[PDB]
């Protein structure tokens, strides 16, 4: 059991270091707030 | 320099400090703008 537990945390260290697609839920939070503030400052160039 | 004031460079009116520029520029460019469509650099009509 202790050999399967120590080899299971080692498989998380290579999956988190190879690709960055596992944190897709946290990336959509920052990208949505950066898109809302960029659209607000771009509407000052309009004439209305 | 070193004081934020209201400048009038042939109609380009704003309010902010005037520091020296340290980027590349063109001899046929009068002003520079950012993504937010605000004036970032001002050409001097008299001096270079």
Task: Identify which of B46, B48, B41 has the alpha carbon closest to the alpha carbon of residue B18.
Answer: B41
State phi, psi for B35 to the nearest 5 degrees.
-70, -30
Whole-angstrom Cα distance, residue B18 to residue B38?
15
Task: Identify which of A48, A7, A23, A41 has the alpha carbon closest to the alpha carbon of residue B36.
Answer: A41
Token couple for B35: 């993504």
Check if the beta carbon of residue A28 is closer than 8 Å to that of residue B23: no
Whole-angstrom Cα distance, residue B9 to residue B40?
13
Beta-carbon count within 10 A of A5 CB: 8
From residue B18, alpha-carbon distances to A26, A32, B28, B43, B46 in Å are 40, 34, 21, 11, 16
Q: Give the experimental resolution in Å.
A: 3.4
A47: closest CA of chain B, how far (Å):
14
State phi, psi for B32 to the nearest 5 degrees.
-125, 145
Task: Based on DSSP, count helices (H) and strands (E) in chain A, helices before strands.
Answer: 2, 0
The experimental method, as deposited, was cryo-EM
Chain A CB contacts of B35 under 8 Å are 38
Chain B CB contacts of A41 under 8 Å are 36
Task: Identify which of B11, B5, B17 has the alpha carbon closest to the alpha carbon of residue B31.
Answer: B11
């Amino acid at each position: 059991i202790a050999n399967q537990f120590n080899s299971a945390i080692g498989k998380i260290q290579d999956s988190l270091s190879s690709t960055a697609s596992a944190l897709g839920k946290l990336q959509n939070v920052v990208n949505q707030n950066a898109q809302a503030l960029n659209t607000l400052v771009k509407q000052l160039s309009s004439n209305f | 320099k070193n004081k934020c004031v209201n400048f009038n460079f042939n109609g380009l009116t704003g309010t902010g400090v005037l520091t020296e520029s340290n980027k590349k520029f063109l001899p046929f460019q009068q002003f520079g703008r950012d993504i937010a469509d605000t004036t970032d650099a001002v050409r001097d009509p008299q001096t270079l």
